[PDB]
Amino acid sequence: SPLHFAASYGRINTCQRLLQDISDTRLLNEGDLHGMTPLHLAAKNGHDKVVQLLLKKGALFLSDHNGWTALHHASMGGYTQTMKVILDTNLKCTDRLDEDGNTALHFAAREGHAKAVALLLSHNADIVLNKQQASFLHLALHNKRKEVVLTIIRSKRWDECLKIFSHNSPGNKCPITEMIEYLPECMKVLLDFCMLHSTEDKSCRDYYIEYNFKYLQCLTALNAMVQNNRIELLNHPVCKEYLLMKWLAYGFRAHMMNLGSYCLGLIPMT
């Protein structure tokens, strides 16, 4: 009991007295009524000095009744200074899975802790699906975590965060269609990166802008923007240019040949 209270409330001097009295490690790893341990209690409430002291005393990254780690609690609460203590000391901890297949990155993302997602994602955390075949990026999208997904889109890992999804799932689809479905202002941000400006000089006759269509293709994204009433995404320059490209590609020539086939009966009759 007394160390679970002292660790849970950050009582660093009470811990130093409890651990000098109880110099054996059996007290330092005891199991709470819900299966937690002093190192979990400290990380859950976010005490960087205590979780550090318990690791300096040689506590172990044991797992909850639900299989959660001290890093899963630190992430669930968004306590990035406690995560930094753990991610400094034992980098091998970073990819451990709970009883349901979530990582700490799936917890930081679901709960909306953008800077905790940034820290685990930059500490080379393993992007993966849990037992419900869902990514951390899906868990952010399905909970409307705008600052989490802007962090994931602005990430040096975005195109890796995009390729890791279940193609066989109707519930956890192509992440670009899930952004149009749940978080369309994050899709405005993602399409702004598809416009490249080649002068910063709009008065120059030679000025040009380039549009890249890699997020509109695998008309799935525009069907999805129509089926979700995303009128301010339909009216974006990259969408107006993708459709006008599709019309000049084949659709104009398709329509003009139907009309030209009809005119060949119509005009000779008049």
Partner: protein
């Protein structure tokens, strides 16, 4: 006044529905030849 209310979406919806219908009918090799993953424009 209700066609002109919904018009802004309906026009893009009509274009999207036209092109998807054509792309379901046309052959994959022609789409791979004739589709174009990026375009430059001069304002």
């Amino acid at each position: 006044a209700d066609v002109q209310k919904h018009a802004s979406l309906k026009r893009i919806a009509m274009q999207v529905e036209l092109h998807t219908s054509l792309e379901k009918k046309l052959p994959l090799w022609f789409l791979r030849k004739v589709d174009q993953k990026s375009t430059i424009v001069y304002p």
